[PDB]
Amino acid sequence: DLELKKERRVILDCERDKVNDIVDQVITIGKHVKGYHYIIANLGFTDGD
Amino acid sequence: DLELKKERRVILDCERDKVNDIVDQVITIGKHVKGYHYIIANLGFTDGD
Numbered sequence: 001d002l003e004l005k006k007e008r009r010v011i012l013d014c015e016r017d018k019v020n021d022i023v024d025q026v027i028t029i030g031k032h033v034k035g036y037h038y039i040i041a042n043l044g045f046t047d048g049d
Numbered sequence: 050d051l052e053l054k055k056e057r058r059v060i061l062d063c064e065r066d067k068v069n070d071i072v073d074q075v076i077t078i079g080k081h082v083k084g085y086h087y088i089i090a091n092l093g094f095t096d097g098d
């Protein structure tokens with residue numbers, strides 16, 4: 001559904017557990033190549049993997 | 050080095066252990082989007098993940 005408007009820019013506002021799950025599902029579906037842009041909206045940016 | 054000739058088509062001839070490692074490194078560097086082609090050259094195609 002996020003490809004209906006051809007979205008290139010995603011802001012993730014989750015805690016230290018859901019950020020890892022969303023990143024793992026992005027890597028599984030393959031949406032981390034150059035052309036995309038993500039912002040992990042938290043204070044512990046290096047707390048995730 | 051495989052992006053010097055802009056290679057789109059890779060044939061992997063490895064056993065049941067190295068195929069999983071090469072696929073994991075392809076997923077880590079992000080080369081499994083639409084546009085690339087792969088052939089797992091073995092008899093146990095469904096033996097890997």
Ligand SMILES: *[C@@H]1O[C@H](CO)[C@@H](O[C@@H]2O[C@H](CO)[C@@H](O)[C@H](O)[C@H]2NC(C)=O)[C@H](O)[C@H]1NC(C)=O
Nearest residue numbers: 007008009010011032033034035036037038039
């Ligand atoms: C980082 O992600 C952003 C968003 O996709 C992109 O930044 C663009 O970088 C180019 C090259 O300097 C600029 O000309 C554009 O103005 C930037 N903003 C856009 C397209 O909104 C780019 O894809 C990524 N890389 C860099 C180096 O910025």
Ligand SMILES: *[C@@H]1O[C@H](CO)[C@@H](O[C@@H]2O[C@H](CO)[C@@H](O)[C@H](O)[C@H]2NC(C)=O)[C@H](O)[C@H]1NC(C)=O
Nearest residue numbers: 056057058059080081082083084085086087088
């Ligand atoms: C994914 O599968 C498609 C369809 O099976 C392949 O697309 C080929 O594209 C060429 C060039 O447009 C056309 O001859 C046909 O649309 C397809 N060829 C066939 C069916 O023999 C594509 O090569 C595959 N691999 C990718 C995208 O990496």
